[PDB]
Design a protein around this ligand. Structure first.
Ligand code: ATP
Length: 294
C-alpha cells in the first residue's frame, strides 16, 4: 500500500496541482504517475515562487527524491506539449530521472483520438505511442513496454498518482451527456494508470468552497455556492481518506470553517471517515496550511 492518489471531488478546477506539488515536496515520492487527457493545465507554485503549468507531466515532478515519471495508458497528449514541458524542467529531469510513456498511450495529431485507439484497426500505426515511437524519435527515448511499465511500479518505493477531472464530470454520473468521456473516480484512475488495487494507500480528495464549472439542487448561481449534496455523492463513490479544501482565502473565517464541518458531515453521512486535513489560502506552497493549526 504505497500509492497516494489525488482526486477532485467536484466539477474540477480545485487546485489539485497545488496539493500534488505540496505533497511531493513534503513526502518525497520516487515515482509520480498520471493519465490525463487534454486539459487547461494544472499549476503548482513552490516556496521560492517557481511556477509549473502542466497539461501532460504530473505536478509531482518537484519531489526531491524523484526517480520515475510515468504517463499511463489512459494518457492523451500532444508530443509538442510534452517536449515543451520536459524542457522547462530539464533541471529536474536530469540523468537521474526516467520518464516512461505507456506504450498504449494516445498521441494527438482529444475525443477523436480516443475513438481511433478504440477502433483497433491494425494498419493505423499512427495512434498509440508504441506505433508513433517508430517514426518519431522524440518519444522513442520514453515509451516502454507493458512489462517495463509493470516493473517500474514494482520497483517504486512510494508513488504519487494524480487524478484527472472532477467527480461530478464523470461520464456515468447524473449530468450525462454534459460530462466528460470517462468516469472520474479512484477505480477508473487506477485502471487507466495500470496500478493494481492493493497498491492504494490513501485517496486525497480536493474541493473548493465555491466550485467552478446543470448542477445540484442545493447550489445556485460559472461559479456556484457549496453543494452538500454534491459532496455527499462524491464521498460515497470516491471515499477520500483526507480532504484538501482550497480557495478558503475567498471567504471569511466563519465561511470556510462552516464548509469544513459540512464536508465532514457529508463524509459521515456516506460511511466515509475522511478528514479535512489541508486548507489552501493561495496558489503557493507557502499558502497550504494544516487544518489542525488554523
Ligand atoms: N488558493 C488559491 N488562490 C488563488 N489562486 C489559486 C489558488 N489555488 C489555485 N489557484 C490558481 O488557480 C489555477 C489552478 O488550475 P486548476 O485548479 O484547474 O488545477 P487542477 O484542479 O489541478 O486542474 P483540473 O481541473 O484539471 O483538475 C492556477 O492558476 C492557480 O494559480
Amino acid at each position: 500500500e504505497n500509492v497516494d492518489l489525488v482526486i477532485d471531488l467536484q466539477f474540477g478546477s480545485t487546485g489539485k496541482g497545488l496539493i500534488a506539488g505540496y505533497l511531493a515536496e513534503k513526502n518525497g515520492y520516487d515515482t509520480v504517475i498520471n493519465a490525463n487527457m487534454p486539459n487547461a493545465g494544472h499549476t503548482y507554485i513552490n516556496a521560492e515562487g517557481r511556477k509549473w503549468m502542466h497539461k501532460v507531466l504530473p505536478n509531482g515532478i518537484v519531489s526531491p527524491n524523484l526517480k520515475r515519471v510515468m504517463l499511463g495508458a489512459g494518457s492523451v497528449f500532444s508530443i509538442n506539449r510534452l517536449m515543451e514541458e520536459i524542457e522547462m524542467s530539464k533541471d529536474l529531469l536530469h540523468d537521474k530521472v526516467a520518464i516512461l510513456i505507456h506504450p498504449m498511450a494516445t498521441v494527438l495529431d482529444s475525443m477523436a483520438a480516443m475513438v481511433e485507439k478504440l477502433q483497433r484497426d491494425p494498419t493505423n500505426n499512427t495512434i498509440v505511442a508504441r506505433d508513433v515511437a517508430q517514426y518519431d524519435g522524440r518519444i522513442a527515448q520514453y515509451v516502454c513496454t507493458v512489462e517495463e511499465w509493470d516493473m517500474a511500479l514494482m520497483a517504486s518505493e512510494r508513488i504519487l498518482a494524480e487524478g484527472a477531472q472532477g467527480f461530478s464530470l464523470s461520464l456515468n454520473q447524473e449530468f450525462y451527456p454534459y460530462c466528460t468521456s470517462r468516469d472520474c473516480t479512484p477505480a477508473r484512475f487506477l485502471a487507466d494508470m495500470g496500478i493494481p488495487l492493493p497498491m492504494l494507500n490513501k485517496v486525497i480528495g480536493t474541493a473548493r468552497c465555491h466550485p467552478i464549472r446543470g448542477h445540484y439542487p442545493d447550489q445556485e448561481e460559472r461559479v456556484f455556492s457549496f453543494s452538500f449534496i454534491q459532496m455527499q455523492k462524491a464521498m460515497w463513490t470516491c471515499q477520500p481518506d483526507e480532504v484538501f479544501l482550497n480557495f478558503c482565502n475567498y471567504l471569511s473565517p466563519m465561511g470556510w470553517q462552516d464548509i469544513v464541518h459540512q464536508i465532514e458531515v457529508a463524509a459521515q453521512s456516506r460511511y466515509c471517515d475522511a478528514e479535512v486535513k489541508y486548507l489552501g489560502f493561495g496558489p503557493t506552497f507557502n499558502d497550504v496550511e494544516l487544518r489542525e493549526d488554523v
